[PDB]
Design a protein around this ligand. Structure first.
Ligand SMILES: Nc1ncnc2c1ncn2[C@@H]1O[C@H](COP(=O)(O)OP(=O)(O)OP(=O)(O)O)[C@@H](O)[C@H]1O
Ligand SMILES: [Mg+2]
Lengths: 1063, 97, 814
């Protein structure tokens, strides 16, 4: 292997490189392992050790040199790429740039010389290894010098500290190329993803002229004049950071002037909201809300009782008028620009309701001071220069109205950061209380920590507070890899630029590094109390301080591997208590999102149903009563609301809740749940809604080509499935072990074919195949094989039978038992976002016309979260029945169709059933199962395995089949009277045996047989002879005497093995 | 008797179900190929109180169940009595009883 | 408890030291040496132990001397097992009025002992003349019984046992008196090291022991600094300017400086104090290795290492062992807590502040003080343990301080300030929200317009005679002097609790000291003839097999077949769901029982969970797997089985005539009570014509007893088995009133539960009081629904008293 091994050079434009060395590397390591040990350990090997030891030393030498280029090439690649295409950064550090360029050219030459040499380790020798180590040390020095330069840049711009060093380096390298820089500002800022640009003079150059900014959701804010990108990357980005604010400030002055004008003005509120931006609109709503409330308090000091009731009335009319606007078709950006307003105007209405009920008639009551108030006033006696520090020009002007934000003795200016229409959380009495705690912490210049259980989303509340203020909010997540140095940089960066720091999973931090954080934070907090413009940190003392900065840490008491915070740190951070958000207040918003006028009253009713439903219904895993299920029920109700707005809300909601929950609910729970629904809307009468076109075509297709009886219960399930597939991309057809779950989805496809166009379906069993092999994994050799799921996803898009060309609806069927390990790989597809994740990292997007159908017996292995993710459908065994099989078997329509259109050529021919014979079998089947309680009684008949009703019928049919073919010629020769006895007899014999086999187990098998013998002995007109078991007798057509089974007297054989000898 | 996982469902058994209904088996080499299987029959032999007590009810539905009963005086005497009588008759005319 | 691990080696050095301290020269050396060892070892360990555990450890030493019979005491081995754990035995419904039902069930365990076999019948004879009189008398342990029980009262152990069973509260006090009599020079062991305080102990312990190689370990509680006391003592022993000795505080990066200091310290001979040792768990494993190397080297004489740390898990066992442990706990009392609150606040800040602001600060200090004293009470008190620090009180002052500086001459808003104190300042700690309403009561009572005028901080004080008021305007020094005099004696009544609520604490305190002492009790007497755990499990198994458990299980199919399912009711739905849960419990416990019963008498593999069930039966704790099933109510194993059969009895009467609901239902005996309440409302919603959501359940207390045959009253549902804690519901008055002093819990009569629509707006009624109901005495997230009842007193009084309803108190008849 080694005497002849090699390393091909792969050009990196322009350096030959060692790529794929690791494959050789691993083989070399394996040779070193066994080879070195065997020579010393082996006695024979000890004699010839003078050979193995020399070879082992050579193998050992190879590894050091091999690790050495890898440690240099990767790091050399990075530092070289910092120098590459950076004249700006080249001129800045000439001493190192030149030293580095020297090393790179040497490295490019040495690698070319090696591609001429054979084994790299043999070529490396020792002197070469020492030279490589020296070059690597020289390159490191360049990295250290570059790191110092980055810190100076980090001091200049606060956003750079938050940005990753790899991104930072990229931005500094491409300082000329503006559009590439603007790409990474999405990571720094809450909004402002990129910038719009004027097409340049020469097409080769990238644009500098910024006309507008683009949000993360593509909302455009146009700048007043052209924004030119100046030289230094930090210098033009800091001018941009200020130009964001300036432009938001400049529009608000226009927005508030037009805000007063729309009130009395002919132009509606809802139309004015459209014109302006989601952030500015929402602020200006809150501003004219506070003015409005302030005019209502001043009137009530006059004595007008109606002042509070009219302010209530007005706020409740705008809420309704806006609710109609979300219902009528809008643009998805305009949805939240309008729905975020719905979530603040609902709270506003709840505030004025609360003021009228408590009867608070004084301004500067706590109740008014408590609420987050927004004031647009040029206060001529400005205290704002004392309360915080004046930063921006407009704050210092004192001739133009500034935006101030007052709440319980904490007044700080609206900083104008751009958030770009991220969804505002639903306001609730807990979040109002939470805002009080955090604001008081800032008022006292100390940290504010909210502690709650998992799923509370406390981090999201603290973010949405800073969003209302318009200060930037940064989110940090700690995986216990955080160091003193890495943490210090964040705090240093955060202090430099006014920015709220929220720490996710702060609880899971090493008690060592935490005791630093406490000292670092203490030094900042100590500076804020002094209120000094500049302060001195432990290292890198001279840093710009800003009063507007605040530190928020989110602890989880219940989290596993929790570390107790030091008493010194606990005293600094004010603890707040956090509870799960009330299901009424979230549901109320979701209902107002879909445009229900009575949403409030319905929400309190809706939540109460679900809460009562969990308690009174039997605990089922397939039932989802979570918020995620509620939204998916409302979204369906919302489309139906938009269809018929003129219909009242309470009757519409009634019909929606019943329709969608009925399928999931079992028969035991269907009766109670229907009666439970009656409690909420007793006067309202629900009318069942069924699509007549879909129901007709399903019934017609099932008789024509499926050869199965279109039973009113069966067809209802198919229609219910078809609805679920339309709303929900992913669906679970759950059910009992023996039903027609498979037939229901199969019938739907053949109906879609008759309805529209042919619908390909790719059936697989996920549980059967190994979880790794199904999804597909890397082999020993560096090559990726396509998974069974993964290839169907490539095949269904194009270049296969399932290709999306002529097929309106395709869906891949899965019929395995759901598992948390197996579903975890598919959990990305389960979610609303149609994204597929693989080990190869090949990106596949699920089409809107693609669906997933899972078919499971028990959802016990599945997680409660997994049930929420998708739309469930339960099929009750009794509702389908076994009659439709029996009717399909007696008609032979099912069987006849399968023979006509299958690749199964070698299929046994089923006997022709006489009209007289059919009418006996039909009566006999029906008469023996319905009338006999004793047959289905657990006590009377003891089974070994829990056989399903359907399974026993399938065996009767297959036994009866063979008995007819053998005696078909005899049944025609016989008279109809003795034939009618003979066909009954055939059934009894077949029935006996079809339930006979399953009978067994217990202490004695004989006792369980005798019990079963007794009940079956009453087999209508036909009787069995006494002192014999029903099994021991078989019906003879010629004799008609039920002649007992004749056994052949054993014959001696010369077989040596005893197991071969058969009696 | 095939090893059951945490989840209480056997991977080798679940495969047989895919074969019985759909009649297509995905080969671990060339997973794109359907590899349809035809004119196949499967004859189960299941021992209770052994490994997994019960198999999946969706497979067990496709199979027609049958039971062998535990040994009986009348069953034993007819089986073994006929073996011994055929061998003891060759030994001696006596000692048949 | 963790960090109480003591080395063999350190114990051996203390044991030897005790021998060298003995000055007797073979006159009575062998006796006096034993006595000196006990004292020497006890005082070492006591320092290491917390205040609450110091009692527990002394109880062991005496019981272990008694077990081995080193000192002659009158006891029985069976009676010592009964003392450590008393099983409540049901069977006898007949009790005495004054005696609690729980006390009677403990007496039925006492009857099984041969010495107190005849005690049960003696008790019935002249009970009111003697036992009632004695029960009622305070310090009962000193009082002699007049029924010729003087012979039991001579023998201190046998007496001690009877005192627990009758009066749980006086056990902790009586035990101390028993300990003193039995143990030699026991009066010196009770006094212990209380006379020497703390500062004198620390000066003594450094000089007398741990000269070299044995580093000193400090365990500090919040608001206590070990460094301040050691530095004063350090200066007297040797010249300590801060150069010779270094008080190095452990921070990240300063681990190398501490390593250099300790390395330098050994060869130099100067002692080295390290603080916040718990803050670096990696460095303790490193430090351990350095101490082991230096113990083998043996650097310079008169060298020590002081280490101080908050108690925590993941501290190395090796360090905790080798090192002497010394605990410093601050004096525990309302007055002692109020004093510590004012000492925290800087003298020179309070003098500067005007009389108005310093007066309201005082009332806040009290408010902070009283919350720590409530934490000491479990259910009756908070219902939950929440951390409270001085920093959370300081925070609240700094906000208050600003509000007074803004208002100036204009009157200060309490309404503005009180919300902040309830929702923010001490809202942050409370998540449950039931404790928050209690938290606001204290606050609302303390903060009001009249506060600035002299006003009682303790609630109401109508005929209590404490007369403790907020001090009038005077100099700062005069505020503390008035605090110290006026608080004088600390009682439950001061916080707003009832006197019986303090007795109940000594009960809960007493119970914990014996549950710990059971674990600690070593070798299980070292055989001999007491019944084994597996025998005791077999005996309980036989009692369960004697009962028809397999018959008691209800087949779902039979019950469903009896119901038509067209005339079905909401009630019928709840029972069907309830009996299913019971079936699942009753099947599980019979499976676990018949499996463990087979494992005892049959050759089969014994699972780990089954060994735990056997262990749990001997202890007579409810099993963990069983506890998880059905109700979350903690009881004795024998009480649980008796309670379970009363649940089963309620389902048996359901099985016969299911359609006909029983005239009086018992909410005290359901799996979910809430589920039943949703049912009673459903039945009303059908009969009436409005939304179920709008209807709220409203309880009304009825004077009629169970005797009344009137049932299924239109817009109604009868209930019984409700029990009220911290108050008494008088039948004749028809209202809630202050509890009888000696009666701990007051059973409610037949409760009528009506459904009626909610008020359109939030309405506050003074007469109606909202008390929560809880399934268990613990009251920890077992809230079901808010019951309302009529009270002549203000509600504020009752929320402060903590008054709640409990379903199972073990004061249920028969
Ligand atoms: N309307 C009908 N009348 C009679 N038999 C029917 C009818 N519809 C379907 N069947 C038959 O009932 C059986 C249903 O098979 P299917 O695989 O759907 O059952 P399943 O128990 O849901 O299966 P799995 O456990 O694999 O999910 C098949 O024999 C099917 O042909
Ligand atoms: Mg199937």
């Amino acid at each position: 292997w080694w005497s002849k091994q090699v390393f091909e050079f792969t050009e990196y434009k322009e350096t030959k490189t060692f790529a794929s060395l690791d494959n050789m590397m691993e083989v070399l390591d394996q040779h070193s392992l066994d080879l070195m040990g065997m020579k010393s350990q082996g006695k024979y090997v000890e004699f010839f050790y003078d050979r193995v030891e020399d070879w082992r030393e050579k193998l050992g030498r190879v590894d050091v040199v091999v690790n050495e280029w890898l440690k240099v090439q990767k790091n050399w690649k990075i530092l070289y790429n910092i120098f590459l295409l950076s004249e700006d950064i080249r001129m800045q550090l000439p001493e190192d740039t030149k030293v580095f360029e020297g090393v790179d050219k040497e490295f490019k030459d040495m690698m070319s010389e090696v591609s001429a040499n054979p084994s790299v380790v043999e070529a490396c020798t020792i002197e070469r290894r020492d030279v490589l180590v020296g070059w690597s040390q020289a390159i490191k020095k360049c990295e250290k010098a570059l790191n110092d330069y980055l810190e100076q840049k980090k001091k200049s711009f606060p956003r750079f500290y938050f940005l990753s060093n790899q991104s930072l380096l990229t931005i500094l390298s491409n300082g000329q190329n503006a559009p590439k820089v603007c790409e990474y500002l999405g990571d720094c800022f809450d909004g402002l993803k990129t910038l719009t640009f004027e097409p340049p003079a020469n097409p080769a150059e990238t644009s500098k002229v910024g006309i507008g900014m683009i949000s993360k959701d593509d909302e455009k804010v146009p700048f007043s004049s052209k924004f030119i990108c100046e030289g230094a990357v930090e210098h033009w980005l800091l001018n941009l950071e200020f130009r964001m604010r300036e432009t938001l400030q400049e529009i608000l002055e226009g927005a508030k002037n037009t805000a007063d004008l729309w009130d009395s003005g002919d132009k509606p509120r809802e139309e004015w909201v459209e014109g302006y931006n989601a952030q500015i609109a929402l602020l200006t709503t809150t501003i004219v809300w506070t003015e409005d409330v302030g005019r209502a308090f001043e009137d009530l000091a006059g004595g007008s009782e109606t002042a509070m009731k009219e302010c209530q009335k007005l706020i409740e009319v705008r809420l309704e008028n806006l609710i109609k606007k979300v219902r009528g078709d809008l643009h998805i950006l305009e949805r939240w620009k309008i729905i975020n307003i719905i979530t603040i105007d609902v709270h506003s209405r709840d505030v004025v309701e609360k003021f009228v009920i408590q009867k608070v008639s004084e301004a500067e009551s706590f109740a008014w001071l408590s609420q987050l108030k927004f004031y647009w006033e040029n206060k001529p006696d400005s205290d704002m220069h004392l309360r915080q520090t004046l930063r921006f020009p407009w704050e210092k002007d004192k001739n133009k109205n500034k935006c101030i934000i007052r709440i319980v003795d904490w007044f700080r200016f609206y900083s104008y950061e751009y958030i770009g229409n991220a969804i505002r959380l639903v306001i609730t009495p807990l979040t109002d209380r939470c805002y009080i705690t955090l604001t008081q912490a800032l008022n006292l210049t100390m940290g504010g920590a909210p502690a709650g259980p998992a799923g509370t989303g406390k981090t999201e509340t603290t973010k949405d507070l800073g969003r209302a203020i318009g200060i930037p909010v940064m989110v940090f997540n700690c995986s216990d890899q955080m160091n003193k140095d890495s943490m210090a940089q964040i705090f240093m960066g955060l202090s430099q630029s006014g920015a709220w720091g929220c720490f996710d999973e702060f609880n899971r931090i090493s008690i060592e590094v935490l005791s630093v954080v406490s000292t670092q934070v203490k030094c900042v907090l100590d500076a804020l109390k002094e209120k000094k413009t500049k302060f001195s940190f432990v290292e890198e003392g001279e840093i710009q301080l800003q009063d507007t900065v605040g530190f928020f840490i989110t602890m989880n008491p219940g989290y596993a591997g929790r570390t107790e915070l030091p008493e010194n740190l606990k005293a600094l951070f004010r603890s707040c208590a956090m509870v799960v958000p009330d299901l009424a207040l979230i549901c109320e918003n979701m209902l107002m999102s879909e445009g229900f006028t009575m949403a409030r009253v319905l929400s309190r009713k809706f939540v109460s149903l679900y809460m009562l439903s969990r308690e009174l219904l039997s605990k089922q895993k397939h039932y989802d009563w979570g918020l995620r299920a509620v939204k998916s029920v409302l979204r369906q109700a919302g489309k139906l609301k938009r269809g018929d707005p003129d219909m009242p809300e309470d009757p519409l909601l009634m019909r929606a809740l019943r329709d969608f929950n009925m399928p999931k609910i079992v028969t035991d729970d269907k009766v109670i749940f229907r009666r439970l629904i009656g409690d909420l809307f007793p006067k309202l009468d629900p009318p069942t809604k069924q699509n007549p076109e879909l129901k007709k075509i399903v019934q017609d297709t099932t008789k024509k080509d499926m050869g199965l009886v279109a039973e009113e219960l069966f067809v209802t399930k198919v229609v219910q499935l078809a609805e679920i597939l339309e709303v929900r991309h992913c669906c679970f057809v759950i059910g009992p072990p023996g039903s027609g779950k498979t037939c229901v989805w199969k019938t739907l496809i053949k109906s879609y074919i008759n309805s529209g166009e042919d619908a390909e379906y790719d059936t697989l069993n996920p549980k059967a195949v190994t979880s790794d092999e199904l999804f597909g994994a890397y082999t020993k050799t560096k090559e990726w094989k396509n998974g069974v799921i993964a290839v169907i996803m490539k095949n269904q898009v194009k270049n296969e039978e399932k290709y999306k060309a002529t097929h309106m609806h395709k869906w891949s069927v899965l019929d395995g038992d759901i598992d948390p390990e197996w579903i975890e790989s598919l959990n990305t597809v389960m979610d609303d976002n149609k994204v597929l994740t693989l080990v190869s990292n090949d990106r596949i997007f699920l089409t809107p016309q693609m669906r997933l159908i899972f078919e499971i017996s028990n959802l016990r292995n599945a997680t409660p979260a997994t049930v929420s993710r998708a739309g469930v459908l339960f099929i009750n065994e009794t509702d389908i029945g076994w009659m439709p099989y029996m009717n399909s078997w007696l008609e032979r329509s099912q069987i006849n169709i399968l023979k006509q259109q299958k690749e199964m050529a070698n299929m046994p021919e089923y006997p022709v059933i006489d009209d007289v014979a059919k009418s006996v079998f039909y009566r006999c089947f029906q008469s023996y199962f319905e009338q006999n309680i004793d047959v289905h009684d657990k006590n009377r008949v003891r089974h070994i395995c829990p056989m399903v009703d359907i399974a026993m019928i399938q065996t009767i049919c297959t036994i009866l089949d063979a008995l007819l073919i053998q005696h078909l010629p005899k049944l025609k020769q016989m008279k109809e009277e003795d034939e009618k006895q003979a066909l009954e007899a055939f059934f009894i014999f077949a029935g006996l045996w079809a339930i006979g086999g399953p009978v067994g187990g217990g202490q004695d098998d004989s006792k369980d047989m005798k019990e079963f013998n007794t009940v079956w002995k009453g087999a209508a007109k036909v009787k069995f002879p006494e002192q014999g078991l029903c099994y021991d007798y078989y019906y003879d057509i010629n004799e008609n005497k039920w002649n007992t089974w004749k056994v052949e007297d054993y014959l001696p054989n010369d077989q040596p093995l005893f197991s071969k000898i058969y009696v | 008797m095939p090893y059951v996982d945490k989840y209480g469902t056997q991977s080798p058994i679940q495969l047989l179900r895919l074969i019985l209904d759909y009649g297509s088996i995905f080969n671990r080499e060339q997973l794109e190929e359907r590899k349809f299987l035809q004119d196949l029959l499967f004859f189960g032999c299941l021992n209770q109180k052994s490994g997994s007590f019960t198999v999946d009810l969706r497979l067990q539905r496709n199979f027609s169940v049958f039971s062998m009963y535990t040994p009986s005086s009348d069953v034993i005497k007819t089986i073994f009595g006929s073996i011994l009588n055929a061998h003891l008759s060759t030994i001696d005319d006596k000692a048949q009883k | 408890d963790h960090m109480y691990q003591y080395s063999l080696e350190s114990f051996i050095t203390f044991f030897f030291k005790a021998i060298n301290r003995t000055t007797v020269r073979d006159e009575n050396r062998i006796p006096t040496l034993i006595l000196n060892i006990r004292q020497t070892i006890y005082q070492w360990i006591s320092r290491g132990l917390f205040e609450k555990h110091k009692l527990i450890f002394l109880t062991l030493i005496v019981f272990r001397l008694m077990q081995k019979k080193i000192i002659d005491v009158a006891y029985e081995v069976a009676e010592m097992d009964f003392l450590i754990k008393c099983p409540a035995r049901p069977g006898v419904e007949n009790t005495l009025d004054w005696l609690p039902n729980i006390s009677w069930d403990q007496i039925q365990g006492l009857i099984n002992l041969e010495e107190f076999r005849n005690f049960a019948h003696q008790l019935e004879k002249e009970a009111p003349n003697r036992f009632k009189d004695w029960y009622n008398e305070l310090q009962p342990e000193d009082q002699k019984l007049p029924l010729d029980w003087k012979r039991l009262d001579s023998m201190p152990f046998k007496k001690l046992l009877v005192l627990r069973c009758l009066r749980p509260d006086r056990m902790t006090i009586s035990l101390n008196n028993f300990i003193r009599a039995v143990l030699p020079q026991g009066d010196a062991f009770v006094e212990m090291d209380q006379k020497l305080a703390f500062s004198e102990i620390l000066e003594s312990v450094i000089n007398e022991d741990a000269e070299s190689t044995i580093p000193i370990f400090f365990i500090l509680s919040p608001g206590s600094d070990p460094v301040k006391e050691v530095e004063k003592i350090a200066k007297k022993k040797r010249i300590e300017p801060g150069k010779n000795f270094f008080n190095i505080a452990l921070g990240q990066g300063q681990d190398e400086i501490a390593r250099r200091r300790i390395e330098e310290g050994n060869k130099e001979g100067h002692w080295v104090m390290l603080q916040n040792i718990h803050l670096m768990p990696t460095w303790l494993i490193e430090l351990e290795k350095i101490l082991d190397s230096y113990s083998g080297e043996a650097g310079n004489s008169e060298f020590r290492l002081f280490l101080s740390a908050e108690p925590s898990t993941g501290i190395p066992i090796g360090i905790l062992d080798r090192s002497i442990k010394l605990t410093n706990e601050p004096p525990a009392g309302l007055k002692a807590n109020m004093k510590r609150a004012w000492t925290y606040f800087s003298k020179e800040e309070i003098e500067d502040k005007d009389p108005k602001i310093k007066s309201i600060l005082f009332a806040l200090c009290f408010f902070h003080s009283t919350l720590i004293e409530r934490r000491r009470f479990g259910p009756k008190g908070w219902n939950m343990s929440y951390p409270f620090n001085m920093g959370d009180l300081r925070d609240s002052y700094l906000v208050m301080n600003r509000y007074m500086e803004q208002n100036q001459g204009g009157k200060v808003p309490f309404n503005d300030l009180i919300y902040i104190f309830g929702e923010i300042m001490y809202g942050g700690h409370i998540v449950d929200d039931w404790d928050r309403r209690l938290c606001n009561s204290y606050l609302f009572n303390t903060m009001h317009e009249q506060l600035f005028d002299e006003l009682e901080l303790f609630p109401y004080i109508e005929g209590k005679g404490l007369s403790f008021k907020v001090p009038g305007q005077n100099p700062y020094e005069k505020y503390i002097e008035h605090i110290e005099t006026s608080l004088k004696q600390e009682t439950p009544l001061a916080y707003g609790l009832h006197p019986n609520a303090e007795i109940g604490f000594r009960t809960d305190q007493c119970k914990t000291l014996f549950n710990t002492l059971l674990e600690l009790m070593p070798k299980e007497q070292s055989r001999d003839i007491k019944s084994s755990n597996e025998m005791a499990s077999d005996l309980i198994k036989q009692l369960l097999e004697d009962s028809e458990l397999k018959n008691k299980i209800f087949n779902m199919e039979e019950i469903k077949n009896k119901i038509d399912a067209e005339n079905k009711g909401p009630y019928q739905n709840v029972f069907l769901q309830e009996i299913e849960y019971m079936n699942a419990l009753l099947s599980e416990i019979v499976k676990d029982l018949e499996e463990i019963g087979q494992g005892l008498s049959g050759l089969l593999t014994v699972s780990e969970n089954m060994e735990m069930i056997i262990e749990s039966i001997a202890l007579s704790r409810v099993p963990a797997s069983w506890q998880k099933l059905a109700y979350p109510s903690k009881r004795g194993l024998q009480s649980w089985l008796a309670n379970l059969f009363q649940r089963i009895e309620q389902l048996n009467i359901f099985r016969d005539d299911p359609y006909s609901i029983p005239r009086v239902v018992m909410i005290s005996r359901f799996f979910n009570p809430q589920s039943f309440l949703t049912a009673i409302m459903q039945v009303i919603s059908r009969a009436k014509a409005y939304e179920l959501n709008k209807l709220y359940i409203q309880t009304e207390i009825t004077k009629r007893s169970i005797e009344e045959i009137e049932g299924a009253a239109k817009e109604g549902a009868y209930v019984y088995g409700f029990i009220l804690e911290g108050a008494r519901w008088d039948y004749q008055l028809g209202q809630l009133e202050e509890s009888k002093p000696k009666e701990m819990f007051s059973v409610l009569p037949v409760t009528y539960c009506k459904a009626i629509p909610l008020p359109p707006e939030g309405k506050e009624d003074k007469s109606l009081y909202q008390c929560p109901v809880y399934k268990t005495e613990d009251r920890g997230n077992t809230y079901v629904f808010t019951a309302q009842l009529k009270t002549r007193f203000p509600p504020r009084k009752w929320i402060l008293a903590g008054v709640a309803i409990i379903m199972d108190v073990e004061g249920v008849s028969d």
